[PDB]
Short mmCIF file of C-alpha atoms in Angstrom, two decimals:
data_model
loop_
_atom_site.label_atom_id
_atom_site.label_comp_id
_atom_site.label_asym_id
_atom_site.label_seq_id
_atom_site.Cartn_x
_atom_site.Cartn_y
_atom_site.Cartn_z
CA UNK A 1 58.05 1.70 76.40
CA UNK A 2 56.67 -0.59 73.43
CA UNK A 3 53.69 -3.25 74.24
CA UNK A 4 52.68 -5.76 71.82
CA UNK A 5 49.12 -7.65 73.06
CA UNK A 6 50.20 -10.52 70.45
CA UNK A 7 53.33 -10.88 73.04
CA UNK A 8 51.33 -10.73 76.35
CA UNK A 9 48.94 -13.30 74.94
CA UNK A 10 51.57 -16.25 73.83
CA UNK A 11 53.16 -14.96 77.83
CA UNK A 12 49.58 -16.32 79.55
CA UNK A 13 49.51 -19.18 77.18
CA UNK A 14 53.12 -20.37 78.01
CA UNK A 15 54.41 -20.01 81.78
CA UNK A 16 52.19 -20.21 84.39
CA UNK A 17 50.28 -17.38 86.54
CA UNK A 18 52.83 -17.61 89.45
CA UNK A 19 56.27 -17.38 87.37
CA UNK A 20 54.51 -14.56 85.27
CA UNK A 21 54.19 -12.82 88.52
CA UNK A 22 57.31 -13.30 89.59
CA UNK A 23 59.26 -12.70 86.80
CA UNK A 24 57.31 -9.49 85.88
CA UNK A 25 56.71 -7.82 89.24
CA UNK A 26 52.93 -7.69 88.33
CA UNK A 27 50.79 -8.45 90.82
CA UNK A 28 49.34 -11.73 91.34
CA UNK A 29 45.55 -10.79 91.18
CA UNK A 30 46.60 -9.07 88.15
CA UNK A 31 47.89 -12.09 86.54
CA UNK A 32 45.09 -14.46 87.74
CA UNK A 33 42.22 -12.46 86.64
CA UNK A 34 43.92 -12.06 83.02
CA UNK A 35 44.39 -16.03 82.94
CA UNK A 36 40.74 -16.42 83.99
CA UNK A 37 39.60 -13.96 81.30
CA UNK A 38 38.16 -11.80 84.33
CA UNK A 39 39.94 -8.73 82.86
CA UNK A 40 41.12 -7.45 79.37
CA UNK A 41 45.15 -7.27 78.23
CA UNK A 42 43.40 -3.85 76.36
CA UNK A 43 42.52 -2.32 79.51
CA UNK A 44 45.79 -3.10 81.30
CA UNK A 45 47.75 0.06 82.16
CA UNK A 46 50.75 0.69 79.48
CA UNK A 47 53.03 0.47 82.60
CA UNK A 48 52.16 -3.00 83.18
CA UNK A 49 51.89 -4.04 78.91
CA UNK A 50 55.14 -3.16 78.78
CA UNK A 51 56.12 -5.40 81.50
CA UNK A 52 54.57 -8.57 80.25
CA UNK A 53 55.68 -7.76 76.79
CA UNK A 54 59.60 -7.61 78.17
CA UNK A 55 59.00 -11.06 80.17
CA UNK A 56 57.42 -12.12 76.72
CA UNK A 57 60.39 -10.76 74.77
CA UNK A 58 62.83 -12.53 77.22
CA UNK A 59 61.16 -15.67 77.37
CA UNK A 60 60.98 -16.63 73.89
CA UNK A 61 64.89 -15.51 73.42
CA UNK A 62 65.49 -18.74 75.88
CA UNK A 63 67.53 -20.88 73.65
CA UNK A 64 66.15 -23.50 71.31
CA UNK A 65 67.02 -26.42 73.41
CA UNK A 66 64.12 -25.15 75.95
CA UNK A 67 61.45 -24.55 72.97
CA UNK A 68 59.78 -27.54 72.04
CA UNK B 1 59.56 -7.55 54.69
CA UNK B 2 61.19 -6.50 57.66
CA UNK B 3 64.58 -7.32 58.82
CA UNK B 4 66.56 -7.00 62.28
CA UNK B 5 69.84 -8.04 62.52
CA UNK B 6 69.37 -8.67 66.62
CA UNK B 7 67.56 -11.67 65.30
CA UNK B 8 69.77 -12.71 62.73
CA UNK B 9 72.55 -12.95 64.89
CA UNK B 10 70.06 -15.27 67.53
CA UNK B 11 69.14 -17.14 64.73
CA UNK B 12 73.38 -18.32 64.26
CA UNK B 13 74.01 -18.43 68.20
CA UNK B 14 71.26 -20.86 68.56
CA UNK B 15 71.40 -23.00 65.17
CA UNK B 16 72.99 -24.93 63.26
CA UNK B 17 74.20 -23.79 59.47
CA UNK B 18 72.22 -27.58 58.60
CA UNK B 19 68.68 -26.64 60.32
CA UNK B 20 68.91 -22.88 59.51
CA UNK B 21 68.81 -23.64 55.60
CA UNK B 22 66.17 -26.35 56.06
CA UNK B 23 64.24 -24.35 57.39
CA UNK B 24 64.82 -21.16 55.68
CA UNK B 25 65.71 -21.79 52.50
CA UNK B 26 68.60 -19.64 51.90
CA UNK B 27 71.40 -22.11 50.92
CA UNK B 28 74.09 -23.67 52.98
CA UNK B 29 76.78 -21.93 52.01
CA UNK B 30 75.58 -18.75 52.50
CA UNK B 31 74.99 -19.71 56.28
CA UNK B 32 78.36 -21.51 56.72
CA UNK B 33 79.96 -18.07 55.20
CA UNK B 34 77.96 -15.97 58.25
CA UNK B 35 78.38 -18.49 61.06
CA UNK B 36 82.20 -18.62 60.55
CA UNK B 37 82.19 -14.90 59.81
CA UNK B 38 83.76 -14.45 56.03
CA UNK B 39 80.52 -12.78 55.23
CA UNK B 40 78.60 -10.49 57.14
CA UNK B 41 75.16 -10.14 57.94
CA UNK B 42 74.67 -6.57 57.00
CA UNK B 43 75.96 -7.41 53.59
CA UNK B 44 73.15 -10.10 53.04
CA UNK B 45 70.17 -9.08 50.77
CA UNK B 46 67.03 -7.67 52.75
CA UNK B 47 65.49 -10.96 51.24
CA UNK B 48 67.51 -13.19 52.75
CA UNK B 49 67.82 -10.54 55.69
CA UNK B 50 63.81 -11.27 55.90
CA UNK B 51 63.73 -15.38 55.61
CA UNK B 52 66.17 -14.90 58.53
CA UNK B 53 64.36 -13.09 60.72
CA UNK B 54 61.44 -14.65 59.90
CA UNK B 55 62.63 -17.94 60.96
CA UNK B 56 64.14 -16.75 64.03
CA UNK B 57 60.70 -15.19 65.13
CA UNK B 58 59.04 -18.36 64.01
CA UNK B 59 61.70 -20.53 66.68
CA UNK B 60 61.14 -17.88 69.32
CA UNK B 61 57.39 -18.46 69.43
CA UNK B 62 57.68 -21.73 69.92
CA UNK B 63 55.99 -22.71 73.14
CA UNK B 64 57.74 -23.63 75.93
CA UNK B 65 58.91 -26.71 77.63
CA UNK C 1 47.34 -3.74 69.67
CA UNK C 2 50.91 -2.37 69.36
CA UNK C 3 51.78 1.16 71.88
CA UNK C 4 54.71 3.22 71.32
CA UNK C 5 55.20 5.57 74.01
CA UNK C 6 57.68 7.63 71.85
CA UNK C 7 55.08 7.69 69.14
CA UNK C 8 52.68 9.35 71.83
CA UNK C 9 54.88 11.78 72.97
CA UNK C 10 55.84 13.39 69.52
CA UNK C 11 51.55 13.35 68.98
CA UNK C 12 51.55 15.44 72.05
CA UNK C 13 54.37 17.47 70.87
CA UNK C 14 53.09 17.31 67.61
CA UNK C 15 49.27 18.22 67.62
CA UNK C 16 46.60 19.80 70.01
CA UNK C 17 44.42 18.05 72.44
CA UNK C 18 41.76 19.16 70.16
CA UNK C 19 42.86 17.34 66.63
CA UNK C 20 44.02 14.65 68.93
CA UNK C 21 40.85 14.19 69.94
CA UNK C 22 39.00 14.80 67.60
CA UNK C 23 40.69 12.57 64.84
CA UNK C 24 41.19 9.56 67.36
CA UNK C 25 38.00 9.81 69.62
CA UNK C 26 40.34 9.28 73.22
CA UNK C 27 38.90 11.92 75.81
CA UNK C 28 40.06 15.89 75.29
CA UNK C 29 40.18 15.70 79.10
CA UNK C 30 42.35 12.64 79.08
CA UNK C 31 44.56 14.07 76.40
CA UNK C 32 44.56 17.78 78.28
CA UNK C 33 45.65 15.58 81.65
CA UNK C 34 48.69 14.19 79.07
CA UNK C 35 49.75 17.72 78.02
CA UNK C 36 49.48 19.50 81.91
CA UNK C 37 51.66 17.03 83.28
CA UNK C 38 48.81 15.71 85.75
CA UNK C 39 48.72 11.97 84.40
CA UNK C 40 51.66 10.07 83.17
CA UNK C 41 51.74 8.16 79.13
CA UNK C 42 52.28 5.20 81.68
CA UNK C 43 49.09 5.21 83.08
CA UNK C 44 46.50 5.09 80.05
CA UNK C 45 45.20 2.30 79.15
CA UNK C 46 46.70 -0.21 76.40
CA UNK C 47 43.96 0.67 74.33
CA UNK C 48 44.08 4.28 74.29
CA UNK C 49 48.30 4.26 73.90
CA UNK C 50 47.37 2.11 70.81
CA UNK C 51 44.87 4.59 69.43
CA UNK C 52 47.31 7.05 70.27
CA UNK C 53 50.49 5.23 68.48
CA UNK C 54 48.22 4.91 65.63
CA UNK C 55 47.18 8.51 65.11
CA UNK C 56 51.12 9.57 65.52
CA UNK C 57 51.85 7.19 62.48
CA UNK C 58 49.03 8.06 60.66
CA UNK C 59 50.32 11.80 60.67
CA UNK C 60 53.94 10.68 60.31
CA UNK C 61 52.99 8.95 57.38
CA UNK C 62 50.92 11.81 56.15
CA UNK C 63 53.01 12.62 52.17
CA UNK C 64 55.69 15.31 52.41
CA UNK D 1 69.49 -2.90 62.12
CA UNK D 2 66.42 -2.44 60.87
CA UNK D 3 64.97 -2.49 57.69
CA UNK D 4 61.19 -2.28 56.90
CA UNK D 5 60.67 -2.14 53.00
CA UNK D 6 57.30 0.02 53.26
CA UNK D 7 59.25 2.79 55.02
CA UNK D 8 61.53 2.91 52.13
CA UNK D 9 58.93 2.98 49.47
CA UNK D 10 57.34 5.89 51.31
CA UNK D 11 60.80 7.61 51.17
CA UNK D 12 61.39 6.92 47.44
CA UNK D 13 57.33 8.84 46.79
CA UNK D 14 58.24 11.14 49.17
CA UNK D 15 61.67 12.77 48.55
CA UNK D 16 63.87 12.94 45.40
CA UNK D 17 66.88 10.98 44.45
CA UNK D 18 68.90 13.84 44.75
CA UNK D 19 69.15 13.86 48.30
CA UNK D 20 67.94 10.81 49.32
CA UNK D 21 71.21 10.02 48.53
CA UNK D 22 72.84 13.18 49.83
CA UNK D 23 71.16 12.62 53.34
CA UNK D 24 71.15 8.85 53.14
CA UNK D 25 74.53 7.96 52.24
CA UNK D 26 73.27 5.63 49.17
CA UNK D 27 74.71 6.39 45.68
CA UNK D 28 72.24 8.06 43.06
CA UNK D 29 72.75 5.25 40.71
CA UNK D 30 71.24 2.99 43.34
CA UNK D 31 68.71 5.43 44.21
CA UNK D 32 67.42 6.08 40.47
CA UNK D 33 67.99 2.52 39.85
CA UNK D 34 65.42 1.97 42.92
CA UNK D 35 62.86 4.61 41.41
CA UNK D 36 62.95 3.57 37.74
CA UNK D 37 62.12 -0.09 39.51
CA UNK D 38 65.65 -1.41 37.29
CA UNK D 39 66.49 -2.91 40.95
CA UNK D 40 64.23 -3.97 43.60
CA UNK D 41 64.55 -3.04 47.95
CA UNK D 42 64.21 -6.34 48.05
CA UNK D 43 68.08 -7.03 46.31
CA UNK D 44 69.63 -3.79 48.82
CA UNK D 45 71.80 -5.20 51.00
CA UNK D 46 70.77 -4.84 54.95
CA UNK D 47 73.23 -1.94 55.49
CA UNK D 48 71.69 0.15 52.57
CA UNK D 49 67.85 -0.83 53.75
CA UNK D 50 69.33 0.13 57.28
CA UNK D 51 70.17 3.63 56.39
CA UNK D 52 66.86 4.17 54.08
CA UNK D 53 64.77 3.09 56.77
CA UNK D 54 66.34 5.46 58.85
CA UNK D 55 65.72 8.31 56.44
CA UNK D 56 62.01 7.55 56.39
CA UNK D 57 61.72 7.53 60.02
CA UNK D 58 63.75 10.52 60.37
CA UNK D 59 61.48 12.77 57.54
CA UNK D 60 58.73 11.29 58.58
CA UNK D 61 58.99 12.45 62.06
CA UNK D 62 59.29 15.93 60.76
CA UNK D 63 56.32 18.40 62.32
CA UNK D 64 52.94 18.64 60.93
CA UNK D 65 53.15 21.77 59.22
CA UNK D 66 55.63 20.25 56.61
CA UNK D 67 53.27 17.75 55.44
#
Protein backbone atom coordinates (compact mmCIF):
# COMPACT_ATOMS: atom_id res chain seq x y z
CA UNK A 1 0.00 0.00 0.00
CA UNK A 2 1.45 3.59 -0.99
CA UNK A 3 -0.02 6.89 0.89
CA UNK A 4 0.79 10.24 -0.25
CA UNK A 5 -0.51 13.09 2.58
CA UNK A 6 -0.18 15.69 -0.49
CA UNK A 7 -3.12 13.34 -2.04
CA UNK A 8 -5.33 13.04 1.13
CA UNK A 9 -5.07 16.79 1.57
CA UNK A 10 -6.32 18.07 -2.13
CA UNK A 11 -9.20 14.75 -1.21
CA UNK A 12 -10.60 17.03 2.03
CA UNK A 13 -10.21 20.13 0.02
CA UNK A 14 -12.28 18.82 -3.00
CA UNK A 15 -15.41 16.45 -2.26
CA UNK A 16 -17.19 16.80 0.66
CA UNK A 17 -17.01 14.85 4.19
CA UNK A 18 -20.03 12.59 3.31
CA UNK A 19 -18.92 11.37 -0.37
CA UNK A 20 -15.32 10.94 1.13
CA UNK A 21 -16.95 8.56 3.46
CA UNK A 22 -18.73 6.88 1.20
CA UNK A 23 -16.53 6.43 -1.44
CA UNK A 24 -13.64 5.37 0.89
CA UNK A 25 -15.34 3.15 3.46
CA UNK A 26 -13.75 5.39 6.22
CA UNK A 27 -15.74 6.17 8.82
CA UNK A 28 -17.65 9.24 9.09
CA UNK A 29 -16.22 10.59 12.47
CA UNK A 30 -13.03 9.86 10.86
CA UNK A 31 -13.63 12.08 8.02
CA UNK A 32 -15.32 14.91 10.02
CA UNK A 33 -12.75 15.32 12.60
CA UNK A 34 -9.94 15.48 9.73
CA UNK A 35 -12.12 18.28 7.91
CA UNK A 36 -12.43 20.11 11.24
CA UNK A 37 -8.67 19.85 11.85
CA UNK A 38 -9.67 17.83 15.15
CA UNK A 39 -7.17 15.10 14.11
CA UNK A 40 -3.88 14.81 12.04
CA UNK A 41 -3.69 12.97 8.27
CA UNK A 42 0.06 11.99 10.09
CA UNK A 43 -1.49 10.11 12.75
CA UNK A 44 -4.05 8.31 10.58
CA UNK A 45 -3.44 4.54 10.47
CA UNK A 46 -1.54 3.48 7.02
CA UNK A 47 -4.67 1.27 6.47
CA UNK A 48 -6.84 4.16 6.22
CA UNK A 49 -3.88 6.69 4.16
CA UNK A 50 -3.97 4.35 1.75
CA UNK A 51 -7.60 4.52 1.36
CA UNK A 52 -7.99 8.22 0.96
CA UNK A 53 -4.96 8.31 -1.21
CA UNK A 54 -6.82 5.61 -3.76
CA UNK A 55 -10.19 7.81 -3.60
CA UNK A 56 -7.63 10.74 -4.21
CA UNK A 57 -5.93 8.87 -7.04
CA UNK A 58 -9.39 8.01 -8.58
CA UNK A 59 -10.87 11.22 -8.24
CA UNK A 60 -8.52 13.35 -9.99
CA UNK A 61 -8.35 10.61 -13.02
CA UNK A 62 -12.22 11.83 -13.55
CA UNK A 63 -12.00 13.22 -16.98
CA UNK A 64 -11.23 16.82 -17.81
CA UNK A 65 -14.70 17.79 -18.62
CA UNK A 66 -15.48 17.42 -14.66
CA UNK A 67 -12.18 19.48 -13.58
CA UNK A 68 -12.70 22.99 -13.67
CA UNK B 1 12.32 14.37 -14.16
CA UNK B 2 10.14 11.60 -13.82
CA UNK B 3 8.04 10.00 -16.38
CA UNK B 4 5.00 7.42 -16.35
CA UNK B 5 3.55 6.38 -19.31
CA UNK B 6 -0.02 5.57 -17.32
CA UNK B 7 -0.20 9.31 -17.48
CA UNK B 8 0.86 9.90 -20.81
CA UNK B 9 -1.60 7.80 -22.22
CA UNK B 10 -4.49 9.90 -19.81
CA UNK B 11 -3.04 12.86 -20.96
CA UNK B 12 -4.17 11.69 -25.08
CA UNK B 13 -7.57 9.97 -23.88
CA UNK B 14 -8.62 13.14 -22.31
CA UNK B 15 -7.06 15.96 -24.70
CA UNK B 16 -6.88 17.30 -27.54
CA UNK B 17 -3.42 17.22 -29.81
CA UNK B 18 -4.37 21.48 -29.91
CA UNK B 19 -4.52 21.99 -25.90
CA UNK B 20 -1.86 19.31 -25.12
CA UNK B 21 0.93 21.40 -27.04
CA UNK B 22 -0.38 24.68 -25.62
CA UNK B 23 0.03 23.69 -22.74
CA UNK B 24 3.03 21.58 -22.85
CA UNK B 25 5.09 22.78 -25.22
CA UNK B 26 6.15 19.85 -27.11
CA UNK B 27 5.03 20.61 -30.72
CA UNK B 28 1.94 19.61 -32.57
CA UNK B 29 3.12 17.23 -34.60
CA UNK B 30 4.70 15.26 -32.28
CA UNK B 31 1.23 14.88 -30.44
CA UNK B 32 -0.81 14.31 -33.65
CA UNK B 33 1.96 11.41 -34.43
CA UNK B 34 1.04 9.73 -30.69
CA UNK B 35 -2.70 10.38 -30.68
CA UNK B 36 -3.15 8.65 -34.10
CA UNK B 37 -0.52 6.09 -33.10
CA UNK B 38 2.47 6.33 -35.91
CA UNK B 39 4.70 7.07 -33.02
CA UNK B 40 4.78 5.63 -29.79
CA UNK B 41 5.04 6.88 -26.47
CA UNK B 42 7.84 4.77 -25.23
CA UNK B 43 9.89 6.01 -28.10
CA UNK B 44 9.46 9.74 -26.99
CA UNK B 45 12.48 11.40 -25.18
CA UNK B 46 12.29 11.24 -21.22
CA UNK B 47 12.05 15.13 -21.78
CA UNK B 48 9.18 15.19 -23.56
CA UNK B 49 8.18 11.91 -21.57
CA UNK B 50 8.43 14.51 -18.44
CA UNK B 51 6.45 17.79 -19.95
CA UNK B 52 3.83 15.04 -20.49
CA UNK B 53 3.41 13.80 -17.38
CA UNK B 54 3.84 16.84 -15.90
CA UNK B 55 0.94 18.32 -17.56
CA UNK B 56 -1.22 15.47 -17.02
CA UNK B 57 -0.56 15.69 -13.15
CA UNK B 58 -1.03 19.39 -13.40
CA UNK B 59 -4.92 18.64 -15.16
CA UNK B 60 -5.52 15.93 -12.59
CA UNK B 61 -5.15 18.32 -9.66
CA UNK B 62 -7.38 20.47 -10.84
CA UNK B 63 -10.19 20.90 -8.35
CA UNK B 64 -13.31 19.64 -8.88
CA UNK B 65 -16.61 20.73 -10.17
CA UNK C 1 4.74 12.33 3.90
CA UNK C 2 5.00 9.51 1.31
CA UNK C 3 4.69 5.42 2.96
CA UNK C 4 5.65 2.50 1.03
CA UNK C 5 4.65 -0.55 2.65
CA UNK C 6 7.00 -2.62 0.37
CA UNK C 7 9.78 -0.28 1.33
CA UNK C 8 8.99 -1.28 5.09
CA UNK C 9 8.93 -4.72 4.64
CA UNK C 10 12.41 -5.17 2.88
CA UNK C 11 13.72 -2.67 6.16
CA UNK C 12 12.35 -5.40 8.26
CA UNK C 13 13.83 -8.00 6.14
CA UNK C 14 16.67 -5.98 5.68
CA UNK C 15 17.94 -4.65 9.15
CA UNK C 16 17.42 -5.35 12.96
CA UNK C 17 14.93 -3.77 15.23
CA UNK C 18 17.94 -2.36 16.79
CA UNK C 19 19.60 -0.23 13.67
CA UNK C 20 16.02 0.34 12.79
CA UNK C 21 15.60 2.00 15.69
CA UNK C 22 18.23 3.39 16.38
CA UNK C 23 18.91 5.22 12.98
CA UNK C 24 15.12 6.30 12.63
CA UNK C 25 14.08 6.96 16.34
CA UNK C 26 10.38 4.78 15.84
CA UNK C 27 10.00 2.56 19.11
CA UNK C 28 12.34 -0.88 19.32
CA UNK C 29 9.12 -2.22 20.85
CA UNK C 30 7.02 -1.04 17.98
CA UNK C 31 9.52 -2.29 15.47
CA UNK C 32 10.01 -5.82 17.61
CA UNK C 33 5.85 -5.99 17.45
CA UNK C 34 6.56 -5.56 13.30
CA UNK C 35 9.11 -8.42 13.21
CA UNK C 36 6.97 -11.09 15.78
CA UNK C 37 4.06 -10.88 13.73
CA UNK C 38 1.92 -9.29 16.71
CA UNK C 39 1.01 -5.89 14.87
CA UNK C 40 0.37 -5.53 11.23
CA UNK C 41 2.60 -2.61 8.70
CA UNK C 42 -1.20 -1.59 8.34
CA UNK C 43 -1.66 -0.44 11.59
CA UNK C 44 1.27 2.16 12.33
CA UNK C 45 0.75 5.30 12.01
CA UNK C 46 1.31 7.45 8.67
CA UNK C 47 4.05 9.01 10.31
CA UNK C 48 6.02 6.21 11.47
CA UNK C 49 5.45 4.14 7.82
CA UNK C 50 6.99 7.42 6.45
CA UNK C 51 9.98 7.38 8.76
CA UNK C 52 10.13 3.90 8.00
CA UNK C 53 9.93 4.27 3.94
CA UNK C 54 12.54 6.78 4.43
CA UNK C 55 15.14 4.78 6.33
CA UNK C 56 14.56 1.74 3.63
CA UNK C 57 15.60 4.31 0.84
CA UNK C 58 18.13 5.81 2.66
CA UNK C 59 19.89 2.28 2.93
CA UNK C 60 18.82 1.35 -0.61
CA UNK C 61 20.46 4.27 -1.75
CA UNK C 62 23.45 3.65 0.42
CA UNK C 63 26.69 3.42 -2.78
CA UNK C 64 27.41 -0.14 -3.94
CA UNK D 1 6.75 2.80 -17.40
CA UNK D 2 8.65 4.53 -15.26
CA UNK D 3 11.51 6.53 -15.50
CA UNK D 4 13.05 8.67 -12.66
CA UNK D 5 16.41 10.29 -13.93
CA UNK D 6 18.07 10.33 -10.27
CA UNK D 7 17.74 6.54 -10.12
CA UNK D 8 19.68 6.32 -13.24
CA UNK D 9 22.42 8.64 -12.26
CA UNK D 10 22.84 6.57 -9.10
CA UNK D 11 23.17 3.49 -11.41
CA UNK D 12 25.70 5.09 -13.80
CA UNK D 13 28.12 6.02 -10.07
CA UNK D 14 27.25 2.90 -8.95
CA UNK D 15 27.93 0.07 -11.47
CA UNK D 16 30.13 -0.04 -14.63
CA UNK D 17 29.21 0.22 -18.22
CA UNK D 18 30.10 -3.14 -18.74
CA UNK D 19 27.17 -4.62 -17.36
CA UNK D 20 24.93 -2.04 -16.98
CA UNK D 21 24.47 -2.87 -20.30
CA UNK D 22 24.79 -6.62 -19.95
CA UNK D 23 21.98 -6.63 -17.20
CA UNK D 24 20.09 -3.67 -18.61
CA UNK D 25 19.65 -4.44 -22.11
CA UNK D 26 21.14 -0.85 -23.26
CA UNK D 27 24.09 -0.88 -25.73
CA UNK D 28 27.63 0.13 -24.28
CA UNK D 29 27.92 2.88 -26.74
CA UNK D 30 24.87 4.41 -25.12
CA UNK D 31 26.01 3.57 -21.79
CA UNK D 32 29.67 5.15 -22.16
CA UNK D 33 28.12 7.80 -24.16
CA UNK D 34 25.86 8.43 -20.87
CA UNK D 35 29.05 8.34 -18.51
CA UNK D 36 31.46 10.45 -20.58
CA UNK D 37 28.19 13.02 -20.40
CA UNK D 38 28.55 12.99 -24.76
CA UNK D 39 24.59 12.32 -24.35
CA UNK D 40 22.32 13.32 -21.69
CA UNK D 41 19.22 10.81 -19.68
CA UNK D 42 17.42 13.48 -20.52
CA UNK D 43 17.66 12.61 -24.73
CA UNK D 44 17.06 8.38 -23.74
CA UNK D 45 14.07 7.49 -25.06
CA UNK D 46 11.26 6.28 -22.32
CA UNK D 47 11.89 2.57 -23.09
CA UNK D 48 15.72 2.88 -22.38
CA UNK D 49 15.03 5.22 -19.04
CA UNK D 50 12.36 2.38 -18.34
CA UNK D 51 14.82 -0.39 -18.20
CA UNK D 52 17.68 1.81 -16.32
CA UNK D 53 15.34 2.73 -13.78
CA UNK D 54 14.60 -0.68 -13.31
CA UNK D 55 18.24 -1.62 -12.86
CA UNK D 56 18.64 0.94 -10.10
CA UNK D 57 15.73 -0.25 -8.25
CA UNK D 58 16.66 -3.73 -8.72
CA UNK D 59 20.65 -3.19 -7.32
CA UNK D 60 19.57 -1.00 -5.11
CA UNK D 61 17.32 -3.32 -3.36
CA UNK D 62 20.20 -5.64 -2.96
CA UNK D 63 20.89 -6.54 1.05
CA UNK D 64 22.86 -4.41 3.30
CA UNK D 65 25.90 -6.27 3.46
CA UNK D 66 26.68 -5.44 -0.28
CA UNK D 67 26.76 -1.86 0.27
Amino acid sequence: MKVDTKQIEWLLKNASGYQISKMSGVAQPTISALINKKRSIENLTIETGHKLTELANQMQKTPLEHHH
